[PDB]
Structures are given as structure tokens and as C-alpha cells.
Amino acid sequence: AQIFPRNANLLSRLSIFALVLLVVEGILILGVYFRSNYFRQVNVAIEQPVAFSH
Amino acid sequence: EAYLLPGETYTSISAKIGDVPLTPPLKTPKGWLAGFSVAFFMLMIFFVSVTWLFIRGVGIWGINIPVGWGMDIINFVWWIGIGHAGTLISAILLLLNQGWRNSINRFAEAMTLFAVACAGLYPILHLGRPWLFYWLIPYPNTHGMWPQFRSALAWDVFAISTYATVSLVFWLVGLIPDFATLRDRAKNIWVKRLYGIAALGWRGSARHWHRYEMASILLAGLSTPLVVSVHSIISLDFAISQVPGWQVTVFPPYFVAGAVFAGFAMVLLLMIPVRTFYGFENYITLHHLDVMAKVMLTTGMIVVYGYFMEVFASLYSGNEFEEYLLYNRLFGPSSWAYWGLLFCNAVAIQPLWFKKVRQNIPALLIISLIVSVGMWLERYVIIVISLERDFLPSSWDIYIPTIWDWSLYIGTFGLFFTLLFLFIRVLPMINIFEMRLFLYQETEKAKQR
Amino acid sequence: IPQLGQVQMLGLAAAVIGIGVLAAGYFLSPTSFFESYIYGYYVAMTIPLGCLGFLMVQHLTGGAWGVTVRRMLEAGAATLPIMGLLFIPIALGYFDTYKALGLEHPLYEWANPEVVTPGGAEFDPIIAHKVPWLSPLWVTARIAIFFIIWSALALTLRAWSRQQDAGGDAKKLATRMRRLSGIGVALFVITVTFFSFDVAMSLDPHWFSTIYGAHYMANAGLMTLAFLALMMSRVRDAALFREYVSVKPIHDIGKLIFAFTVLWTYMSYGQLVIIWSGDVAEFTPWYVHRTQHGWVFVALALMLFAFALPFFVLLFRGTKRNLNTLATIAGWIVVMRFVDMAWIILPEFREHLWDIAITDVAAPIGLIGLVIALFAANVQQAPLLPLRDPNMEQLQ
Amino acid sequence: LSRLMIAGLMVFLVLSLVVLLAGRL
Amino acid sequence: VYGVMAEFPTPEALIEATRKAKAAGYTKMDAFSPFPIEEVIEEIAHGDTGVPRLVLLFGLIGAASGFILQYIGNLVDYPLNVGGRPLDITNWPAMIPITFESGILLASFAAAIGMIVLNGLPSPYHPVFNVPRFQYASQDAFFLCIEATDPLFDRSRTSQFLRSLNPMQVSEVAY
Amino acid sequence: NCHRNPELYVRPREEVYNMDYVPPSNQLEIGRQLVAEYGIMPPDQLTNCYVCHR
Amino acid sequence: VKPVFLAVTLTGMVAFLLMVWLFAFYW
Amino acid sequence: IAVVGKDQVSRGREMHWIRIDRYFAGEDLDNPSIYMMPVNCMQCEKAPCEVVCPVAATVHDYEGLNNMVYNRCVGTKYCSNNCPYKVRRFNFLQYSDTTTETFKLAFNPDVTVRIRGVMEKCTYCVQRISGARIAAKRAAVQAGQSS
Ligand code: HEC
Ligand code: HEC
Ligand code: SF4
Ligand code: F3S
């Protein structure tokens, strides 16, 4: 009550919670990128110079 | 002698330790600016050294095929050993109920965190493929590969990580009450709310000090075997190998004693100017320096005991390789480091036995400097000399360090001192609530006569 | 005081029983007598040496636990000269007294003329390489010099502690003992390390360990700490403890027992992992014999009964504050310490768990009984807790 | 408060399911 | 409405004042001091902190997790033979360090986080701070407060009881 | 995955053609028999590093 | 209080399912 | 195997998987008997170089061979300090040629060309062992023997 509003007690705890979620989301995004079909070029029909149809 | 001399008051401790921080930026003393300028210059030397090491490679050092570990490991063991004494002061003395840890635990622990931060770069810098350091960490990968966990470098990764994290959370727990005292004296509104969220709104009260004291007791009781096991693992990395000079069974305690030896030397070297510059002669008295030099002398004697055990082992066994190890140390091409070892950490530590020398400040500064040089020479003798001449005589060569690993050394000194100068500028360098509690305890003791 | 007399009578009865069955085993077999007497001397030496070391350590760093058992540490350390006379039988073994007393071959390998002399029938170059150092004259001289140092330190400290009860306790008789303990600590570390090298490690001249000896100091420290906790529980109502001793010294000694238990486990594991991972053939035969012919079961029992069980029990704030519970744990620790020394010394002789004879159990009890009897006589000689001591204020 | 924490959880669950779908897109 | 304040000047006065209360029967009272008094602490907060049980639980989990990770990783999932070292439980050497370090980490984290959570420490705002001289509470200026949650709920009598005790200043702390 | 558990993916030598061929319902029994008949080595060797990397 | 303990519990298992999916049955 | 300069050999960074050692021994030492001895990887069944690499880049093979995998080495250089015979060579810098086209044409396509920061040692010419094993397995299944 000296230098802080009343809502800060809730915000501070919520901020710590939000921080943990953001950290977990960061690792998640990292792993999804290194296993995606764009990074590994999976299910991507690479265009050939002569357009050969198997 | 007494550990707290004058008739200090709780407000005397609060104002005297709080006046070092919270000083307006335009009122910063010129000595801090000169020291920070020197530390920043050496930090730029560090940046140039690391940049060139990344661009060219670890081949810029003097490491070769026989000596695959040079100063990139010596400076690592030296730095990681510097923080053992501060961890002992901030944790072991808390369990021992020693009253001379109240005025130096904050600065010492800060030295541990900064020394661990400096030592944490060599395991990445010396890698040769540094960006793959995370392969030593058990992480989910697209391959299915695990670290070996039977090598000592895997133990080393887990040890440094645990040591750094536990020392950081213990330091922050100890800083919380000082954060509260700072946000109570911060005056300015935006200097407040910064220490306020750092103090987490401490509101120093009962039902809170009880859990604080018990958690601090548990944390110190846990961090004591932590730092012991850390330096024991930094000893195991050489002791696990088959190198004649490296497979020595007394390495774990010898390394622990040597770490706290060099740590007390660095702490005395860095706390004497801190004591004599700020008006802290009432808190860091001469009895502090006396007992610290006594602990340093005891650890140095344990190191000399380790020297004798190595010599007895070389003379006791009939192995050609232990005998040649002793001969290569005594009269080899690198015998200069062994002679400097024997002069520094064995002859120069003897004057600490007496009382007049133990109460002299310049003698303590010179002895601490000589001890630090001898500790670097001891790590050199253990690693380089033993690695130069192995079992096959054809695989013998000499190790000559280059300029870049030296540049990394001075650079690590600059980063260490930059972090220390920032710490003494922002945060209080002496734990305040522990000092006023010590004053209250001395008042109660004088009441009971 | 009456409890101390009962302990003295029990120690005398255990000593005379052990000596009697030891003499019976000697008449049945003269060699096995000396083989067990070495182990008994090694295990009984831990109480006086650990008492002297802890006395000098608590003098350097004064505390409440140090003032609580200062007189008990002095009484335990004052038994060292009698222990030196008890070394005479072992010295007779490795001297020319063999071929008499029933010893066909000398008690130690480095004392057999067929081994250390070049051109002998059993010449071993590794053992003979140490022929000037490992000699009966040199070993006896080193042992006698160590005993002169130990007896001089213990008797001088005890004499100064007795004089402290007369006058001048603040200016002198407290700083003098501190400085003597300061130099004595380094002296005691060197002497005990080489004593452990000479008596026990020299049984197999093919193997050496640098950490060894320091393992012996931590082992002797744990034994004398559990012994102090037992004797504190015995004399807890001597009208001197009741008025000057609280639960804080008992809690500190319990914490010291816990710290020395994890310290001993840390040293033993350190030696094991260093020898295990580096599979050098010059250090492997030691851990081969201790893991063979059933000796592995002894090591596993030490791993659990002497580490995990004490570590978890003493982890709690209780069981160390209560003197009764701490004494019960100390008794289990003492029993385990006996087995640990058996695991280190007995394999060299018996080479089988079943080959362990009755004398291997007789000698430890027979010699510790004499140690307890002399300790009880020395503690009844003088009053406990030196009232005239500047550190006595730490008990308030 | 549990309401805000559950709300922040449902947001993290939605964001992650979108990221997981974008990986196998 | 939250409570009343005392602002006792010396630490010994806070001890005596807290002992004057409780005897009166006032409960749910807390005392604020710059340093742990160790005398007020035993009067109003005697019992288990709750930190130890968290440390032991997480520490044993940490040690078990480290041993399980090593055994599964190198002796089950991918059984690599390295230097002829055993792939059985006979590889129990070289599994102690990782296990020990993992247990210490979890136990230490639990103690620090537990002290914060158990105390409800993340509280930047508290009604107590509204009292003007509580800014000086960190520099001397010891305090004592009786909350409205006290069953007595005396209000003015509580202020008068605090006035009977010797206060530098009595204040009515509000939300 | 195949090197450690080849019973699930082995086929009875109709690989060049029979793109329409699909694993039979009793693939485990047929797979174990095919591994024994063709002498597919156990996972101890097939998981070695030098089988692939050199 | 008890509500937020349940909230930080559901948050934890949510993350585990998320993470376990990515590092196991994802590819 | 790459070719380093004279400057890199002066610092003891020659890359050779096999070496011959002469030892000039005997009386006089001015008319000495010369003893030539070839040394490569001994392929130790209990290889001390494998119990020290934290990333498991050096393991043992089913056939008793010592597998040294380049793409896993992080370069701790500990695998060499524990080698009693010192038969492991490290790419302290970038030694393999990249720009010259003719040198790229000389490389053997069955062996990876090492980059900076990895270790090398004698592999019993594993490319020939793998080729013979594959040929033996293929000849065994084509005849229906599973031998
Ligand atoms: C024996 C224990 C090993 C070791 C030490 C490594 N492998 Fe493998 N590997 C195989 C394939 C097809 C790849 C390509 C992966 C991809 O493209 O995503 C790999 C890759 C690796 C790596 C990663 C290299 C890098 O990221 O730079 C590593 C570190 C590695 N390997 C080491 C194939 C196999 C295989 C099946 C035939 C087996 C068995 C191994 N590898 C074994 C090992
Ligand atoms: C299942 C469809 C498989 C996939 C996916 C991969 N491999 Fe394999 N491999 C498979 C079989 C049935 C065999 C025969 C085993 C035997 O003992 O005959 C193999 C074997 C190999 C070999 C040769 C074995 C040897 O001893 O030299 C190699 C070199 C090999 N496999 C490599 C390899 C690589 C690199 C793969 C990923 C791209 C891979 N295989 C996948 C079945 C299957
Ligand atoms: S690299 Fe050295 S230690 Fe390893 S297998 Fe080859 S010779 Fe043996
Ligand atoms: S230590 Fe290992 S990481 Fe490479 S340098 Fe040796 S194979």
C-alpha cells in the first residue's frame, strides 16, 4: 500500500504463472519447428525440371 | 579482539550500508569509474578473444596431440575453485554457528556467482564445436542419443548447473530482506517498485522469519555437500583417467582444500581494499582477517600434505611411470612450475603461523597474491606436465601457450571485475539484516556478561 | 561416577574374556593370533587417536560441544602411552623374534629375508624396492617417534587443562593450548597418515592409495564421536551435566556424527570410483579380494547399514536432540565401524568370509575393553567440565 | 485467482494446439 | 479496519508487548521487525515451518529421477558398451554423482520456492504498508499489529489496549 | 525403429513389384519367421554406429 | 486458494500432454 | 586424411592414423641398433577412450571394433588424453581442402571428410569391413542359407 496498487498482489502471482507458460510455450515452438514438414521438407512435392510423372 | 567494535545502532548499520547504493549517478566516486573502465577494457579484450576463437577455432591455442588440455582447462579449474571459499563462508559457517560470517557472506557469495559465471564459459569455449554443447544435456532429440553419464564431464555438466542455480537462489533469498530495506529508503518513486518487486513485498514479520531461518538452514546444509561434490567431480575428471600423474586417489579432498585455499586468498585480496575504502572498518575488523588467514593456512597445510602424499606415492611404487613423473617434475623441461609451486604454496604460507604477520595487512596482500600464483602453477603442474610425457616415449612433445589463451585469461578477469563493480554499485555489499541481528546478539551477550 | 565405575567393570570383563579366548586361539594356532591382534590393535586405536584429534580441533575452534566433552577427550587421549606398549607384540612379529613364538614365516612380507633380498627364493622386485624404508628398524623408529609426539601432546594438553583449574585461565592456559593445538593438527595429520601407511597398508606392498590414511582419520573420528555419544548417555546425571549441559551440545554432536558419516562415505566412494573407472592393474587386486568369496556381502551391508540407514535416521531434527535415541544410533554405528575395519584388514589374512576365526572377533573386543577401562579411570581421576574456562560462557 | 489462471491455461492450450497443427500443416 | 498498530521503539519493548498480549487473549496478531527477534517468533509462531517436508519429498524424487534416467538411457533404451563397463546394476559406480546432483537441485528449489509460497510472499501490496511510519520499519521502527480477524474484534478497545501498552504511535491500518 | 524391430516391416521378397501389397494381419508371426529364415541379425549389431556412420 | 492449486495442477498436466505429444507421438 | 602445413606440424598437430617409431637403442648410442615399430589404434576391448567422451561419440562395436563417430564428437579432446598410445588426431583448425576441385576429386567417397573440431583414429578400414559384411549377408540370403 506504500508504492503499489491493490491489484498488484494478483498481478504478480499471475505474472509468475504467465512467465512459466511462456517458457513452456518457447520450448514447444522450438521442438515443433525442428520436426515440422516444412523444415524436413516432408509431403512437399518438389518441382522437377522436366515434370516427370511416376 | 571483537568482531564488532563500536557502539553501532540498527539505524547506524542501515544508513552506513545503504549509503553505498542509492547514490545519485552524478555522485558516483571517481575510483569506481576508473575500476569499471579498466574492467570494461578487459571485457572488450574478452570479446575480441572469443570472437577470433569462434571464427578460426581452438587451433589458435597451443594445444597439440599429447597435451590436448592446456590453459583452457587450467583457468577453468582455477576459476571454479575461487568460489569454494565463498560458498564455505555463506553456507558452512552458517551451520558451524560462527559469528564472523555476517559481514563477508554477501561479498563472498557474489564472488562465487561471478567466478562460476566466468568458469562456465571454458567448457563451451574449449569445445572446438562450441554450439553443440547442449548435446551433453539429456534433451529430446530426433536421433535417440543419450550422454554417456559414465564420463566425468557429464557429472561436471550436472554439477555446475546445480551449483550455479542453487547459489543463485540462495543469494536471492539472502538479498530479499536487503531489497526490502532498499525500497524503504529508495526515496525516488521509480527506484521504488524496482526493489519492491525484488523484495516481493517482504514485510519483515514473524511467521515469516521462522520459515526464512529454517529454509536458510536447510539451504546451507544442502549446499555444503553440493560444493564439496562439485570440486570433487572437477577432481574426478583427472582421477578417472589412467594418466600416471592424474590417477591419484587423494585428488577429491586435495582439490577441495586447494579450491578453498585459493578462494580465501582471492577473498582477502578483494575485501581488504573494500574494507579500507568504505567506512566499513567497524564491520570488517582485524579479527576477521586473522581468522580468515588461519583458515587459509590450514587449507594450505592440507595442500602441502597432498604434495607429500604425491611424493610418497611416486617413491613408494616401483612403477617406471610414477618415477619418471617425479623426475619430469623436478628436472624436466617444465620443472620451473614445480619449483614455483614449492616456493609459493609451501614456503610463503609459513609466515601465516605467527600472529604479527597474521595481523599485518600488506603481508596478507602479498601472501594472497603469491598463493594465487602458486595455485595456477599447481594446476599447470598437475595437467600439462603429466600430459607431456606419457607411456610411449615417441608420443612426447612440449606445450607452449600462445597469446590468445592469455587474452582469454585477462578477458575473464575483466568480465569478473565488471560484474563485481556492477554488484557493488547497485546492491549492498554487506548483508544488512544479518549485521543488525549480530549487533542485537552482542547486546544480549553483554547483558548476560 | 557410579555409572562410570559400572562401565569400567564391564570393560574389564570384556577385556579379560577377549584376552582369554585370544590366548586359547594362540595356543591352538600361533599365526592366527598375530593376524587377529593386528586387526584388534587397528580397531582399538581409533578411540584415543580420534579423542586427541577432536580435543585439538575443539581447542582451535571453540564451541559448546567442545567444552561439553573436553575432559572426556583429554581422558581418552591420555591412554595413548599404554597403546604404545601394546604395539610391542606387533614389533616382535616383524623382527628376528620370528622362528620363535610359533611364527614360521614373518608377520609382514617386507620383513621376510626370502623376499626383500635379491637372489632370494621368493624375490619380489616391487616389495624389495622399498627395502630401506620398509625395514623393521625404520618402521619401529617411525612408530616410536609418532608415539613420543602423541604422548607429549596429550599429556601436555591434559596437564595444562588441570592447571587451568588453579588460576590464570583467561590470560594463559587457553591461548597456549590453542597454539599447541594449531601446530599439533598438522603434526597429528602427518603422523596418523604414516601410521596408517605403516601398520595396515604395508600388509600388501603391491598396492598403495593416497587417499588412504585420511579415510582412517574420518573412520576414527566417527568411532570416537559415537563413543562420546554413548558415554554421554551413560553419565547424563553426574550432577555436573545436570547444571551446565543442555540439549544444544547433544544436537551439535549428533550433527557432527551425521557429517562424519557422510564424510566417511564420501572418501570411500571416492577411492572406489577412482580405482574402478581407471582399470589399472596395479590398483585392482585390492577391490578384487574385497569382492570375492562372500566379502562382497560385507561391502553391501556397509553401504546400507552404515550409510543409508544412519543418513536417513539422523536427517531428522529428532533422534539427535534426544540423547537416548542418539546413543542407540551410535551403538549401531560403532558395530558397523567394526565391520568396516574387518572388511579392510581381515581379507588380507583370511581370504574367505568363512575363514574368519574366533580370534578375529576376540582381539577387537579384548583390546577395546582395556581402552574403555583406562578411559574410565582417567575420567574418574579429574572432574568433568572445566569451570574455569572463558569458553564456559558458551554453555549459558 | 483460479479464474484468471484457468483462462491463461486455456489460452496456452489453444496456442499450443495451433502450433502443433502448424508443424504438421 | 484491517487492524491497529503499535510502533514500539526498541526490540525488547516489542517482546514485552507481545507477551502482554496473548495473556490478554488477543490472537491473530503479527509483529513486524527488521531482524528476526527470535523471541517474538516463538511467542506467536511455534511449530513446523512446513519447508522440511517439501525438501525431503522433492529431494528423494530428484535422486530417484537421476538414477532412473541413467539406467534407462544407457542400460535400457540404447545399451552402448563403453570401455567394457558393465551394463547391469554393477554399473552402480558412476551413477552416484548425477543422482546426487539431481536430488540437491530439487530439494534446494523446493526450499526457496516453498518459503515464498507458504508465506504468501508475492505480496507487493499489503494493508500494513498504509501506516506512514512503516517505511522506516526496515530501519529500526519495530511494529506490532492486531488484525480484525481476531475473534474479539474490539476495535476501539483494541486501540485502547494498545494505548495501555506504551506506543510511540497507535494507528488504525485499513485496506 | 526398423533395425531394432524388423519383424513389423519385413516382407516375403515381393518388394520390387506389389506396391499394392500390404502387411498381412499376422505380420508378427510371418515377420519372426522371415527374420529367422533370412538371417536378419539381432538389434545388437544393427544398432552399432559404424553400420551407418563412417 | 484451493481453486488456484487446482488451476496450477490442470496447467501442469495440460503442458505434459502437450510436450509428450511433441516428443513422442508426433514425428 | 588431411594435409596440414609445416607450421601445424611444428606445433605437433600432424594427422596420421598410423606412425612408425624408431628408438635408437643400445650401447655407444653412436652405433645404435634401430628399432622401427608401426603404431595405430590398438582397438582395446576395454578401451579407456570410450569411458571419457560425454556424448558417447566413441563406443564399441559388436565385432569388437572401436567406433569413432565424427558427427557426434563435440571435441572435448578428453578422448585423446585417456588414450595410452596417443593414436587420436584432432582437427584443431580447418585442415581438409574445400576450394581446390582436383583435391575434391581425389577424396574416397566411402569415407567422410572431417571438418574442424572432430577427432580421428584408425578404424581398421571400416568401409571395407562393411562392404564385405554386406556382401556376405547378401550372398547368404540370395542362396537361402541365413549363414
Ligand atoms: C552409434 C551409437 C551412433 C551414433 C554415435 C550416431 N548415430 Fe546416427 N544417423 C542415422 C541417420 C539416418 C541420421 C540422419 C538424421 C537426420 O537426418 O535427421 C543420423 C544422424 C546422426 C547424428 C546427428 C548428426 C548431426 O545432427 O549433425 C548423430 C550425432 C549420430 N547420427 C550419431 C543412422 C544411424 C543408424 C541406423 C542405420 C544408427 C544405428 C546410427 N545412426 C547410430 C549412431
Ligand atoms: C525397415 C524398413 C528399415 C529401415 C527404415 C532402415 N533399415 Fe537398415 N536394414 C533393414 C534390414 C531388414 C537390414 C538387414 C539386416 C541384416 O542383418 O541383414 C538392414 C541393414 C542395414 C545395413 C547393412 C547391415 C550391415 O551389417 O552392414 C545398413 C548399412 C543399413 N541398414 C542402413 C540403414 C540406414 C542408414 C537407414 C536410415 C536411412 C536404414 N537402414 C533404415 C531395415 C531397415
Ligand atoms: S583410441 Fe587409443 S585407447 Fe581408444 S581403442 Fe584406440 S588405442 Fe585404445
Ligand atoms: S572426447 Fe569425445 S567428443 Fe570427441 S574429442 Fe573425443 S570423441
Ligand minimally distant from the alpha carbon of residue B65 = 4
- Helices B320-331 + B286-316 axis angle, to 10: 130
Closest among C310, C342, C303, C315 to C226, alpha carbons compared: C310
Sheet strands side by side (includes E29-32):
E29-32, E143-147, E3-5, E171-173
Q: Would the CB atoms of B151 and H13 count as touching at under 8 Å?
A: no
- Residue closest via CA to ligand 3's atom 8 equals H44
Q: How far apart are CA F32 and CA F52, in angstroms?
A: 24
- H119 Cβ inside 6 Å of ligand 4: yes
Helix, strand counts (H, E) of chain E: 5, 4
Alpha-carbon distance values, B94 to B88, B107, B222, B267 (Å): 9, 15, 12, 18
Rounded-to-integer distance, Cα C182 and Cα C185, Å: 6
Q: Is A13 annotated as a binding residue?
A: no
Contacts of B196 in chain A (CB under 8 A): 3-4
Instruction: Give distance in angstroms: CA of H57 to centre of ligand 4.
Output: 6
CA of H68 to the centre of ligand 3 (A): 10
Burial class (CB in 10 A: 0-12, 13-18, 19+), D12: buried
Question: Among B57, B135, B237, whose Cβ lies nearest the Cβ of H92?
Answer: B57
3-state secondary structure of E145: strand
Report how far residue H92's alpha carbon sits from residue H75's, in angstroms, rounded to the nearest whole number: 9
- H71: amino acid identity, one letter: N
Residue C358 CB partners (closer than 8 Å, separation 6+): C21, C25
Alpha-helical (H) ranges within C29-135 are 30-44, 46-60, 64-68, 70-77, 80-86, 88-94, 113-116, 125-128
Burial profile F15-38: b = 16 or more Cβ within 10 angstroms, e = fewer: eeeeeeeeeeeebeebbeebbeeb
Task: Identify the DSSP state of A46.
Answer: P
H44 three-class SS: coil
Q: Return the residue matching grid coordinates 612433445.
A: B397
Using a 6 Å cutoff on CB, does residue H41 contact ligand 3? Answer: yes
Asked if A36 and D25 come within 8 Å (Cβ–Cβ), the reply is yes
Neighbours of C230 (CB within 10 A): 18
The helix/strand/coil state of C218 is helix
A54 and chain E: CB distance < 8 Å anywhere? Answer: no
Interatomic CA distance for residues F43 and F38, integer angstroms: 15
- Chain H residue closest to C280 (CA)? H48
The owner of cell 582397438 is H43
SS3 E3: strand
Give the number of the atom of ligand 3 that is nearest the alpha carbon of residue H88.
1
Nearest CA to ligand 3 atom 3: H83
Q: Which of B147, B152, B390 lies closest to H84 in CB terms?
A: B390
Instruction: Return the ligand 1 atom nearest residue H69 CA.
Output: 5
* CB of H15 shorter than 6 A to ligand 3: no
**CA C298 – CA C344 distance, rounded (Å):** 10
Q: Which of B140, B189, B200 is facing A3, going by the closest CB pair?
A: B189
β-bridge partners, E32: B205, E143
Report yes or no: B74 and B262 within 8 Å, Cβ to Cβ.
Answer: no
What number does the ligand 3 atom closest to the CA of H42 have? 7
Other C-beta atoms lying within 10 Å of the C-beta of residue C102:
13
Q: Using a 6 Å cutoff on CB, does residue H55 contact ligand 4?
A: yes
DSSP-assigned letter for residue H113: P
Rounded to 10 deg, the angle between the B105-119 and B152-185 helix axes is 140
Strand partners, H21: H37
Q: In this structure, which amino acid lies at residue H15? A: M
| Experimental resolution (Å) | 3.2
Q: C-alpha grid cell for residue B341?
A: 609451486
What one-letter code names the amino acid at B410? I
Chain E positions touching A3 (Cβ under 8 A) are: 129
Atom of ligand 1 nearest to the CA of H57: 5
User: Hey, are the CB atoms on B251 and C274 less than 8 Å from each other?
Assistant: yes
Query: Which residue has the least CA distance to atom 33 on ligand 1?
Result: F52
From the list B132, B241, B390, the residue facing H86 with the nearest CB is B390
Please tell me the distance in Å from E46's CA to the nearest CA on chain H: 49
**Number of continuous H segments (helices) and E segments (strands) in chain G:** 1, 0
Helix, strand, or coil (residue E171): strand
